[PDB]
Design a protein around this nucleic acid. Sequence first.
RNA 1: CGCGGGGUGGAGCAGCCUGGUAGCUCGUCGGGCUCAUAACCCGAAGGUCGUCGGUUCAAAUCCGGCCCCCGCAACCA
RNA 2: AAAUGUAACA
RNA 3: AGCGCCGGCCAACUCCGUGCCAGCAGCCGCGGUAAUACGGAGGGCGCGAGCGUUACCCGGAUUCACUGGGCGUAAAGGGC
RNA 4: UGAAACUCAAAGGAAUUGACGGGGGCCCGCACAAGCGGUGGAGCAUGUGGUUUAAUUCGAAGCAACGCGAAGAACCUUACCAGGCCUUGACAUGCUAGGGAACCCGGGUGAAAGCCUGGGGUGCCCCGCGAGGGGAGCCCUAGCACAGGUGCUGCAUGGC
RNA 5: GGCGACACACGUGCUACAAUGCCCACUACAAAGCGAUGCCACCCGGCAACGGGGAGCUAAUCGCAAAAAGGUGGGCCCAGUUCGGAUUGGGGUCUGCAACCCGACCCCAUGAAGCCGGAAUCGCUAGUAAUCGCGGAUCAGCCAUGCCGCGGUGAAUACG
RNA 6: CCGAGGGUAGGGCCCGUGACUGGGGCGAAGUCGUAACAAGGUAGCUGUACCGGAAGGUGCGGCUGGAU
Length: 127
Amino acid sequence: LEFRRMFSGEYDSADCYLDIQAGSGGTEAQDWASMLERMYLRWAESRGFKTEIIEESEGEVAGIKSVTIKISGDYAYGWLRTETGVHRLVRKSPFDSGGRRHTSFSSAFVYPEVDDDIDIEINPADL
RNA sequence: CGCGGGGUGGAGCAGCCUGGUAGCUCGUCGGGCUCAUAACCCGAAGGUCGUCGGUUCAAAUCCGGCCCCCGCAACCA
RNA sequence: AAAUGUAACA
RNA sequence: AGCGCCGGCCAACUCCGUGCCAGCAGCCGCGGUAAUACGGAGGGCGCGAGCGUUACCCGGAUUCACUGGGCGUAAAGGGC
RNA sequence: UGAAACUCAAAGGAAUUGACGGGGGCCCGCACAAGCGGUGGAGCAUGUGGUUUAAUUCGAAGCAACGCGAAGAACCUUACCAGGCCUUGACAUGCUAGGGAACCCGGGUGAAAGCCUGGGGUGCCCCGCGAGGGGAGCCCUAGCACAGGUGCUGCAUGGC
RNA sequence: GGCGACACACGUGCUACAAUGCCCACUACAAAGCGAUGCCACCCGGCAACGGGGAGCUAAUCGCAAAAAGGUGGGCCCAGUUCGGAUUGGGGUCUGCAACCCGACCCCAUGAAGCCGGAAUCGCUAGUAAUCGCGGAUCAGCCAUGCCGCGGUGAAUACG
RNA sequence: CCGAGGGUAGGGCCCGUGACUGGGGCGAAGUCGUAACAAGGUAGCUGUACCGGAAGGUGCGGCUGGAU
Ligand SMILES: [Mg+2]
Ligand SMILES: [Mg+2]
Ligand SMILES: [Mg+2]
Ligand SMILES: [Mg+2]
Ligand SMILES: [Mg+2]
Ligand SMILES: [Mg+2]
Ligand SMILES: [Mg+2]
Ligand SMILES: [Mg+2]
Ligand SMILES: [Mg+2]
Ligand SMILES: [Mg+2]
Ligand SMILES: [Mg+2]
Ligand SMILES: [Mg+2]
Ligand SMILES: [Mg+2]
Ligand SMILES: [Mg+2]
Ligand SMILES: [Mg+2]
Ligand SMILES: [Mg+2]
Ligand SMILES: [Mg+2]
Ligand SMILES: [Mg+2]
Ligand SMILES: [Mg+2]
Ligand SMILES: [Mg+2]
Ligand SMILES: [Mg+2]
Ligand SMILES: [Mg+2]
Ligand SMILES: [Mg+2]
Ligand SMILES: [Mg+2]
Ligand SMILES: [Mg+2]
Ligand SMILES: [Mg+2]
Ligand SMILES: [Mg+2]
Ligand SMILES: [Mg+2]
Ligand SMILES: [Mg+2]
Ligand SMILES: [Mg+2]
Ligand SMILES: [Mg+2]
Ligand SMILES: [Mg+2]
Ligand SMILES: [Mg+2]
Ligand SMILES: [Mg+2]
Ligand SMILES: [Mg+2]
Ligand SMILES: [Mg+2]
Ligand SMILES: [Mg+2]
Ligand SMILES: [Mg+2]
Ligand SMILES: [Mg+2]
Ligand SMILES: [Mg+2]
Ligand SMILES: [Mg+2]
Ligand SMILES: [Mg+2]
Ligand SMILES: [Mg+2]
Ligand SMILES: [Mg+2]
Ligand SMILES: [Mg+2]
Ligand SMILES: [Mg+2]
Ligand SMILES: [Mg+2]
Ligand SMILES: [Mg+2]
Ligand SMILES: [Mg+2]
Ligand SMILES: [Mg+2]
Ligand SMILES: [Mg+2]
Ligand SMILES: [Mg+2]
Ligand SMILES: [Mg+2]
Ligand SMILES: [Mg+2]
Ligand SMILES: [Mg+2]
Ligand SMILES: [Mg+2]
Ligand SMILES: [Mg+2]
Ligand SMILES: [Mg+2]
Ligand SMILES: [Mg+2]
Ligand SMILES: [Mg+2]
Ligand SMILES: [Mg+2]
Ligand SMILES: [Mg+2]
Ligand SMILES: [Mg+2]
Ligand SMILES: [Mg+2]
Ligand SMILES: [Mg+2]
Ligand SMILES: [Mg+2]
Ligand SMILES: [Mg+2]
Ligand SMILES: [Mg+2]
Ligand SMILES: [Mg+2]
Ligand SMILES: [Mg+2]
Ligand SMILES: [Mg+2]
Ligand SMILES: [Mg+2]
Ligand SMILES: [Mg+2]
Ligand SMILES: [Mg+2]
Ligand SMILES: [Mg+2]
């Protein structure tokens, strides 16, 4: 009866991908973006998933502008689709000189895996 | 369909022709300089040589077949 | 001869 | 007997809820876990069969200056 | 010659105090230079970042964090983790009601804690040759107030 | 049980890479401190850690205590060595209720890296640096190569 | 005859609208470089001309509202 939470979402079993992005703020949020990939990596290890990093791009001041991880595991999309959203991080900021309290956002978008095959065969019934 | 040129680390190229030895640049990784990043400095890692087969003692290299890439040609009615 | 430092100063 | 208001201008202050959200806002600005500025309450101030809002006119605006302004550097001397 | 839509709550002049300048002048400090010995390489000790972990408690973050809080982590310390337990409780001030107070000595179970339990005599001022009747010395049991928290905020603070 | 983890990364230190050195034996010269379930003379057993005896000292009295470099002699002969002392095997001691994780010390055996360190970087202007040992706080014991002190020997250089 | 108006033709002005295109204003965050403010690291500004991803550069002349 607890698989009315996860058995309701078409494909809540495909090896999903996590698409994390920096955002408002910049350096601070790129720091927070790298913090948030670490957060989901340690998450996925403590849950039997495979921590499979497909594409990075590190930020130029300090941190990550964007990342994509393959959460290669079982039922992975069910758990991480309820992680889709923009994660605000209100926090206290280290890149601002006089130590001011700042807000910086970064997102986490989550999708499953499809066939990704666009090789439709030409059949003489319709030519 | 024809002719002839290519495929070699993450990227772009060199290496073949006169076989044994795969190099350069950028990147990547560890260290330094800086308050910090870039730049720079020191050290390091990195290639089934498109595949099948095989020339030879030995193939990235030589010779066939296939597979993608590039150029040219495809005329006279 | 040598670049840059965003976004919340009581 | 109701309506507006109680951060400054501008008269009237506390408690709770909230926690850059929900919202306020005429200007300056309020709200990121002790908010007299948001929402409710208690209390208070101002009017009263009215109280506020929007629109428009004059005023404040000597901010088109007749009364009554300016032009080196603030906007402003025409190139002669 | 010369607009408007739209937009902002300013754009501005001069002067002041700072701060800064790959501006200047004059000075100082093992700042450089002059030297001598090191670190960075090795093995080890130690702290830290990470990573790992059930936990590898927590803080310190350029100089001015990193043999720093730690001038002594095997248990204790210990604030973390796992497991076994306790509920006015390891500790304060209470008020109320039952036991006997008070203190020492063993038995069972158990890793220990804890749970269970068998021992034994309470002064006082007192009716006491008498059963018996306390008060409050301190403990035990049941309550209700309360305790307790190295849980957060050093960006609410004092102190250092 | 963990704070002691370990593909890695940085800071602080210890010991070194040797001949101005290492080892053995003998022999000198300090200061500041600490010490009554404490400091332990001296004796004996053990190669030893240590153990068993046992005097003294509320300590300018007695004890820790030997200071070490140094000095005098002997060995080593330039080698990864009589340098270096990591790592590991085995056997023991002591503290402690208890040394698996996770103690210090002794003995036999083993005897690693390291041939003076890239970019870079630290300290010190005189009894200083360098080097040598001694004490204490904490403390059952100790992971102290740390810290706070103490004295011994004792430089180089500063144009600017 | 004139004449409301209707019709034919041609102009003028104004408004709405149009594939596409030019630049402009706003922005809590992006990319590239760092032109100006200190002599801003090539003094700055300027009219003009040519040029360049971009701020901008250079020529000619001018101003000081230019440090030493
Ligand atoms: Mg022809
Ligand atoms: Mg009102
Ligand atoms: Mg206020
Ligand atoms: Mg008023
Ligand atoms: Mg008032
Ligand atoms: Mg809300
Ligand atoms: Mg309101
Ligand atoms: Mg607050
Ligand atoms: Mg509140
Ligand atoms: Mg209160
Ligand atoms: Mg108001
Ligand atoms: Mg209110
Ligand atoms: Mg009336
Ligand atoms: Mg009205
Ligand atoms: Mg008006
Ligand atoms: Mg008027
Ligand atoms: Mg006038
Ligand atoms: Mg005027
Ligand atoms: Mg002007
Ligand atoms: Mg002007
Ligand atoms: Mg004139
Ligand atoms: Mg003109
Ligand atoms: Mg001025
Ligand atoms: Mg001034
Ligand atoms: Mg200066
Ligand atoms: Mg210095
Ligand atoms: Mg020097
Ligand atoms: Mg040197
Ligand atoms: Mg070194
Ligand atoms: Mg080292
Ligand atoms: Mg790392
Ligand atoms: Mg911490
Ligand atoms: Mg810590
Ligand atoms: Mg420090
Ligand atoms: Mg310690
Ligand atoms: Mg132990
Ligand atoms: Mg413990
Ligand atoms: Mg405990
Ligand atoms: Mg403070
Ligand atoms: Mg803090
Ligand atoms: Mg304070
Ligand atoms: Mg422990
Ligand atoms: Mg620790
Ligand atoms: Mg360990
Ligand atoms: Mg290192
Ligand atoms: Mg070190
Ligand atoms: Mg050390
Ligand atoms: Mg040393
Ligand atoms: Mg050897
Ligand atoms: Mg040896
Ligand atoms: Mg070697
Ligand atoms: Mg040698
Ligand atoms: Mg050296
Ligand atoms: Mg040396
Ligand atoms: Mg250097
Ligand atoms: Mg000095
Ligand atoms: Mg020495
Ligand atoms: Mg010592
Ligand atoms: Mg002592
Ligand atoms: Mg001790
Ligand atoms: Mg140890
Ligand atoms: Mg007619
Ligand atoms: Mg007519
Ligand atoms: Mg007509
Ligand atoms: Mg008609
Ligand atoms: Mg447009
Ligand atoms: Mg310029
Ligand atoms: Mg500039
Ligand atoms: Mg300039
Ligand atoms: Mg020009
Ligand atoms: Mg152009
Ligand atoms: Mg270009
Ligand atoms: Mg040019
Ligand atoms: Mg000129
Ligand atoms: Mg002129």
